[PDB]
Design an enzyme around this catalytic site. Structure first.
Site, PDB file in Angstrom:
ATOM      1  CG  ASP A 136      -2.189   0.862   1.033  1.00 44.37           C
ATOM      2  OD1 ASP A 136      -2.552   1.224  -0.110  1.00 44.37           O
ATOM      3  OD2 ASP A 136      -2.836   1.174   2.064  1.00 44.37           O
ATOM      4  CE  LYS A 138      -2.938   4.816   0.293  1.00 44.10           C
ATOM      5  NZ  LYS A 138      -4.419   4.930   0.133  1.00 44.10           N
ATOM      6  CG  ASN A 141      -0.298   4.641   3.439  1.00 49.97           C
ATOM      7  OD1 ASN A 141      -1.027   5.296   4.190  1.00 49.97           O
ATOM      8  ND2 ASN A 141      -0.715   3.541   2.815  1.00 49.97           N
ATOM      9  CG  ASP A 158      -2.304   2.013   6.332  1.00 49.73           C
ATOM     10  OD1 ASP A 158      -2.481   0.854   6.784  1.00 49.73           O
ATOM     11  OD2 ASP A 158      -3.221   2.669   5.803  1.00 49.73           O
ATOM     12  CB  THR A 177      -5.019   3.505  -3.523  1.00 47.29           C
ATOM     13  OG1 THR A 177      -5.364   3.598  -2.135  1.00 47.29           O
ATOM     14  CG2 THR A 177      -5.572   4.711  -4.266  1.00 47.29           C
TER      15      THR A 177
HETATM   16  O1  LIG Z   1      -2.104   8.182  10.268  1.00 49.31           O
HETATM   17  C1  LIG Z   1      -1.267   7.446  10.792  1.00 49.31           C
HETATM   18  C2  LIG Z   1      -1.287   6.077  10.576  1.00 49.31           C
HETATM   19  O2  LIG Z   1      -2.245   5.583   9.739  1.00 49.31           O
HETATM   20  C3  LIG Z   1      -0.363   5.209  11.168  1.00 49.31           C
HETATM   21  C4  LIG Z   1      -0.245   3.825  11.003  1.00 49.31           C
HETATM   22  C5  LIG Z   1       1.032   3.297  11.146  1.00 49.31           C
HETATM   23  C6  LIG Z   1       1.263   1.939  11.009  1.00 49.31           C
HETATM   24  C7  LIG Z   1       0.188   1.110  10.725  1.00 49.31           C
HETATM   25  O3  LIG Z   1       0.374  -0.213  10.573  1.00 49.31           O
HETATM   26  C8  LIG Z   1      -1.107   1.628  10.584  1.00 49.31           C
HETATM   27  O4  LIG Z   1      -2.159   0.791  10.317  1.00 49.31           O
HETATM   28  C9  LIG Z   1      -1.313   2.993  10.723  1.00 49.31           C
HETATM   29  O5  LIG Z   1       0.588   5.741  11.993  1.00 49.31           O
HETATM   30  C10 LIG Z   1       0.606   7.075  12.263  1.00 49.31           C
HETATM   31  C11 LIG Z   1       1.566   7.558  13.140  1.00 49.31           C
HETATM   32  C12 LIG Z   1       1.615   8.914  13.416  1.00 49.31           C
HETATM   33  O6  LIG Z   1       2.539   9.382  14.276  1.00 49.31           O
HETATM   34  C13 LIG Z   1       0.715   9.792  12.837  1.00 49.31           C
HETATM   35  C14 LIG Z   1      -0.237   9.298  11.963  1.00 49.31           C
HETATM   36  O7  LIG Z   1      -1.134  10.135  11.372  1.00 49.31           O
HETATM   37  C15 LIG Z   1      -0.305   7.939  11.655  1.00 49.31           C
END
Ligand SMILES: O=c1c(O)c(-c2ccc(O)c(O)c2)oc2cc(O)cc(O)c12
Length: 274
Positions: A136, A138, A141, A158, A177
């Site tokens: 994923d 992009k 992310n 993410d 996406t």
């Molecule tokens: O928006 C964010 C986000 O999605 C994720 C995230 C990270 C790893 C994952 O495996 C996941 O599912 C989500 O981390 C973050 C860490 C931050 O400090 C600020 C963020 O805004 C995010």
């Protein structure tokens, strides 16, 4: 695998919302015992085995398992995991500079682009070395630590679609996406580390031009374009972009995953290598 089931609110205070999506919301938070700050991602659990709402336990556990393996400056790190009846809550490293996506909307030179890209490549080299496909990648992310510096440092986030690839490929329900997915995703074929390299090609194209290479007027058009490798370098956008930069992109946006540059290839490519 089970997670900490004490109330997260007894150990953390939440603040500004950092983002939200399908079945998740991310809140800035502060650990009461240390004063240290984190991002708490609240992931909605499924309430029944057949529900299409919420994230399956299998999918949540996979993401947490992958996050626990990771320690690299260009990838988000996981601090703790809590859970209750409705949610799994990931306590994640706080990154405060916002999305690369929003940094981009504000304005890159090849130097600025390669500065970001080298960091992305380094993070992906780490992941691929551990046989982890992100699936994923992009601009949304890719987060910046501090956006008020000439050369912002980044971290990949993410890992919701991320998978271990122990057998060279995985074939599962995996689809990100449309603008950024590789043709093998569009065509529901076995997937490996190669799909991330295609996504890097797309990110690179966008970094340099401000334009999305396969974007159509509908999702189906975008997907059809991806599968057909229907993109070109518009002179209006790429007239003063080096031919080597174009070469880098061209060797990533290749339909046959076996002929696509690998992460190691990308680091040795003359546009990237010192
Ligand atoms: O928006 C964010 C986000 O999605 C994720 C995230 C990270 C790893 C994952 O495996 C996941 O599912 C989500 O981390 C973050 C860490 C931050 O400090 C600020 C963020 O805004 C995010």
């Amino acid at each position: 695998t089970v997670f900490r089931q004490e109330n997260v609110d007894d150990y953390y205070d939440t603040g500004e919302e950092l983002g939200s999506g399908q079945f998740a919301v991310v809140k800035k938070c502060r650990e009461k015992s240390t004063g240290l700050q984190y991002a708490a991602k609240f992931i909605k659990k499924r309430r029944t085995k057949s529900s299409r709402r919420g994230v399956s336990r299998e999918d949540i556990e996979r993401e947490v398992s992958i996050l626990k393996e990771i320690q690299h400056p260009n990838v988000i790190t996981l601090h703790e995991v809590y859970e209750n009846k409705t949610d799994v809550i990931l306590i994640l490293e706080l990154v405060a500079g916002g999305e690369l996506f929003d940094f981009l909307a504000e304005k890159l030179t090849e130097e600025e682009a390669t500065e970001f890209l080298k960091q992305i490549l380094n993070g992906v080299y780490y992941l691929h070395s551990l046989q982890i496909a992100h699936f994923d990648l992009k601009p949304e992310n890719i987060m910046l630590l501090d956006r008020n510096v000439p050369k912002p440092r980044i971290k990949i986030i993410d890992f919701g679609l991320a998978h271990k690839i122990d057998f060279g490929n995985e074939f599962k329900n995996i689809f990100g996406t449309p603008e950024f997915v590789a043709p093998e995703i569009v065509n529901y074929e076995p997937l490996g580390l190669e799909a991330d390299m295609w996504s890097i090609g797309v990110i690179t194209y966008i970094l340099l031009s401000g334009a999305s290479p396969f974007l159509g007027d509908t999702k189906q058009e975008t997907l059809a374009n991806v599968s057909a490798v229907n993109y070109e370098f518009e002179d209006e956008y790429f007239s003063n972009t080096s031919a080597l930069a174009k070469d880098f992109i061209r060797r990533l946006l290749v339909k046959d995953p076996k002929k696509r540059m690998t992460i190691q290839d990308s680091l040795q490519h003359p546009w990237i290598k010192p």
